[PDB]
Amino acid sequence: KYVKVQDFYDQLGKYVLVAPGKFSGTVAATDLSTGWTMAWLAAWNYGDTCPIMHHMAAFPSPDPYKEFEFVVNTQGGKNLFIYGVPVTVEDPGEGMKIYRIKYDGTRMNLQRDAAEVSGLGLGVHVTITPEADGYAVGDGQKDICAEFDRETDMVRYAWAFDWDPNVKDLKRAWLDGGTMTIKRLKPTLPGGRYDLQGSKGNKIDWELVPGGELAIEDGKVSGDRPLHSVANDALVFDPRGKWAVASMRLPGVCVVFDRENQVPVAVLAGPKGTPSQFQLVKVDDDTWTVDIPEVISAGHQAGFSPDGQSFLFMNSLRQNNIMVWDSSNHDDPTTWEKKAVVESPDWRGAYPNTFHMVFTPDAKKIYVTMWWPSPTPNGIAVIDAVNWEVLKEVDLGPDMHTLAITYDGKFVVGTLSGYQNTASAIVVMETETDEVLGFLPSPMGHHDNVIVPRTLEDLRISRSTTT
């Protein structure tokens, strides 16, 4: 006569979901096999005065129920003012903290702020190296990305990016092309530390929102240096090692970096109608430039399929499509060539935008998100990654954010975030016939989620290769 919710969880397996809460100021881990929150942490408990808990990634652990470690960052300043919430803290904390957190089988333990350890605070995507010996963070207000060592929380290398527009007018500054500089960033404080915590470094006062390339062009984003902005988003990793790729929203390119030798090696060009690559020019041992004649479209999501054979960059807003490179030559990224573009009427108009993806373990399908401003239903589109075509899309609810997948490939687990003020949930869809199985309560504004990986191999379809 009665339904037990346990039957629903029994089918999911012994997987641990973890998600930060953005405006909620919290991070939580959930047992998908029982429905319990295993543990949660509220950053205000630690004196954090603007705990916008933003992106995160978890290191593999052979048994997450015993222990696991993750990294979660924060945003601050005027990022507090860009949602519908009529917040009242007019001068909030500067955020850009990089927290190290460990779950010990019972509770979450805040271990330290790595931005205080290294001196470098970064506020957008967090990713784990495929060796699980470190992590990377990017930031689109300072335009810096860095890989950090896991043991020491010290920077291994950090790169700063700068835009020199052909036309020094905000409306034309990207559309009419410009030169992007890539500059090795060196510490200036004793013990090899950076002087770049909080707001130090910020070119603009908040991270650009969806369709923010328009806001910046119209002079609606305050800051010292918006003409010089490229809006770095992420540093993602080739799961075969060696390469890391930094994605630049505004000039619509990704930069391939040699992790070991600490040099850029290639610049991939995002928009449909451009060549596979632009020309990287060395200026000196610390400085490279790339000329971009015009920016046909901004881009956002960047990442690798889990065999590392395909590299993807999503064009957004001006174009909406998935640009796909053959990246099978692991020895030379300057040979990576455009091999497909995924297009669909599903990419209706300016919206939806696709900012998140996850692959199946065998690389044959991709789940990608479809985001719209309130009130249009947001949801998930399924991509056949062999023919590079959209299979299907499903409507879910408001404000779709990140996707993770269970490591046996059976269930995609996503978050919907209420634009920080309305309905929010965890969503579960089964990959066998791509049907939504339903929603679980989630009183948080997640801009990220992961399933804690068990092995290095698990990282290939976790927060390492994609965002």
Distances (CA, A) of 417 to 26, 313, 399, 426: 13, 24, 5, 9
Residues 288-317 that bind a copy of itself (CB under 8 A): none
Q: Is 131 annotated as a binding residue?
A: no
Please tell me the chain's helix, strand, coil percentages from 3-state DSSP, rounded to the nearest 5: 10, 45, 50
Q: Which of 190, 331, 349, 386 binds a copy of itself (CB under 8 A)?
A: 190
Tokens encoding 346:
């599903």
Sheet of strand 232-237: strand arrangement:
232-237, 243-248, 253-258, 263-269, 277-278
Nearer to a copy of itself, 25 or 299 (CB): 25
Stretch that binds a copy of itself, among 128-136, 246-254, 353-361, 427-435 (CB under 8 A): 427-435
Least distance to Cu ion, CB of residue 424, Å: 13
Least distance to a copy of itself, CB of residue 32, Å: 9
Integer Rg of the chain from CA: 20
Between CA 450 and CA 402, with CA 302 as vertex, the angle to 5 degrees is 30
Residues 426 and 440: beta-carbon distance below 8 Å: yes
Beta bridge partners of 184: 159
Residues 103-132 that bind a copy of itself (CB under 8 A): 106-108, 110, 112
Q: Which of 84, 219, 273, 293 binds a copy of itself (CB under 8 A)?
A: 84
- Positions in the binding site for Cu ion (CB under 5 A): 233, 401, 447
Q: Choosing among Cu ion, a copy of itself, none, which partner's interface includes residue 401 (Cβ < 5 to 8 Å by kind)?
A: Cu ion
Whole-angstrom distance, CA of residue 152 vs CA of residue 98? 13
**Closest C-alpha among 273, 237, 251, 221 to residue 145:** 237
The secondary element (H helix, E strand) that includes residue 4 is: none
Whole-angstrom distance, CA of residue 120 vs CA of residue 195? 7
Q: Is residue 439 a contact point for a copy of itself (CB under 8 A)?
A: yes
Least distance to a copy of itself, CB of residue 401, Å: 14
Least distance to a copy of itself, CB of residue 185, Å: 8
Nearer to a copy of itself, 41 or 342 (CB): 41
Q: Is 446 annotated as a binding residue?
A: no
Whole-angstrom distance, CA of residue 214 vs CA of residue 132? 37
Q: Is 228 annotated as a binding residue?
A: yes
Which residue ranges are tagged as binding site? 7, 22, 54-55, 90, 112, 125, 153, 207, 228, 233, 300, 316, 330-331, 356, 399, 401, 447
Which residue ranges are tagged as binding site for Cu(2+)? 7, 22, 54-55, 90, 112, 125, 153, 207, 228, 233, 300, 316, 330-331, 356, 399, 401, 447
